[PDB]
Amino acid sequence: FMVSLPRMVYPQPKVLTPCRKDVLVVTPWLAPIVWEGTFNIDILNEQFRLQNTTIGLTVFAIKKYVAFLKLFLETAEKHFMVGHRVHYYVFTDQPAAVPRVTLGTGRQLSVLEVRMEMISFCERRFLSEVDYLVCVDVDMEFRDHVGVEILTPLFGTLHPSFYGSSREAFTYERRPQSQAYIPKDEGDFYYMGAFFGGSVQEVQRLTRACHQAMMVDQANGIEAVWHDCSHLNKYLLRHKPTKVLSPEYLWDQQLLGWPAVLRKLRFTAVP
C-alpha cells in the first residue's frame, strides 16, 4: 500500500515536448533509460521515502583493491542515495584495511570477510535488511548524484565503450559451447558488470543464474571471454531489465572524455 503524495509545485510536463531528443529514453520493452533531464528527482524521492526504502550497496575489495575503499565510500556519502537508508556491504580478505569512513545518519557499513556466488551465503541477510541491492566495482568514485531514479526490479548499465556500437561489435561471448553464447544477430545493449542491481529477489535470481551458467561452462572446460560480464549480458538479454542506466552512471573520463550527450558524469573510473 502506497500513501498519497503531498502537494508539490513543479513545471508541467509537456506532451508535445520531449525531455531529451538526442538519445533513446525508453527501450522497446518499455523500460526507461535513465538520463539527466528525464526525471524529477523530487517526485521520485517522495515516492521512495514514503516506502522507507533501504538500499544495499555491495563492493568487493580483495588484495590491493582495498586501497580504493576510502575514496569510494567518502564519495558515496556525498552522492549515493543521500536522504535514504543505505547499508554498505564490503566483502574483503582484509577486514583491518577497511578505512573508518564517517557516515551520515541512517547509513551503515558491514564488513564481510571472504562475486556471483557470494551475493546469491548472504541471501537471507539481504532479504531481511534491504529492499534493493546495488552491485558495483570498488575502483570507482561518485562525482554526481546517483539516487532513487535507478531503483526498479532489475537494472543494468550501458557499457561506456559500446553505447554507440552495432551489436555485432559487442564483445559478447561468441562460442556456441558457452552458456553465455549470444549470436551475432541478437542483443539489445552491451551492459557492463560494474554496476547492476534491482530488488533483492531479482538480484539473487540473476546471481544464482549466472553462477549456475559459470559452473556449467567450467564443467565443459570453457571460460567466457569477459567472465562475469558475458554471463550478465546473456541473462539481461533473456530477462529484460526494467530500467537501463545511461553511461552517466558508469564512465571513464580519462579514456572517453566528456561528450555533449553526457550532461552529468556520476560514477567514474579511478585512474
From Swiss-Prot:
Lumenal side stretches: 3-271
List of glycosylated residues: N52
Binding site for an alpha-L-fucosyl-(1->2)-beta-D-galactosyl derivative: H159, T171, C229, D252
Alphabetical GO biological process terms: carbohydrate metabolic process; lipid glycosylation; protein glycosylation
Pathway(s) it belongs to: Protein modification; protein glycosylation
Outcome of substituting T102M: In allele Aw08
Binding residue positions for UDP-N-acetyl-alpha-D-galactosamine: F60, A61, I62, Y65, D137, V138, D139
Keyword Transport: no
PTM comment text: The soluble form derives from the membrane form by proteolytic processing.
EC class: transferase
This protein's record includes keyword Membrane: yes
Cellular component GO terms held in the UniProt record: extracellular region; Golgi apparatus; Golgi cisterna membrane; Golgi membrane; vesicle
Impact when changing M140R: In allele Bel01; loss of manganese binding and reduced catalytic activity
Impact upon substituting P160S: Altered substrate specificity in group B transferase
Topology of the protein relative to the lipid bilayer: Single-pass type II membrane protein
Cofactor dependency: Mn(2+)
Reactions accelerated catalytically: an alpha-L-fucosyl-(1->2)-beta-D-galactosyl derivative + UDP-N-acetyl-alpha-D-galactosamine = an N-acetyl-alpha-D-galactosaminyl-(1->3)-[alpha-L-fucosyl-(1->2)]-beta-D-galactosyl derivative + UDP + H(+); an alpha-L-fucosyl-(1->2)-beta-D-galactosyl derivative + UDP-alpha-D-galactose = an alpha-D-galactosyl-(1->3)-[alpha-L-fucosyl-(1->2)]-beta-D-galactosyl derivative + UDP + H(+)
Chain residues that bind Mn(2+): D137, D139
Function: This protein is the basis of the ABO blood group system. The histo-blood group ABO involves three carbohydrate antigens: A, B, and H. A, B, and AB individuals express a glycosyltransferase activity that converts the H antigen to the A antigen (by addition of UDP-GalNAc) or to the B antigen (by addition of UDP-Gal), whereas O individuals lack such activity. Glycosyltransferase that catalyzes the transfer of carbohydrates to H antigen, forming the antigenic structures of the ABO blood group.
Domain remark in the UniProt entry: The conserved DXD motif is involved in cofactor binding. The manganese ion interacts with the beta-phosphate group of UDP and may also have a role in catalysis.
Protein family per UniProt: Belongs to the glycosyltransferase 6 family.
Name of the protein this chain belongs to: Histo-blood group ABO system transferase
Organism placement in taxonomy: Eukaryota, Metazoa, Chordata, Craniata, Vertebrata
Gene: ABO
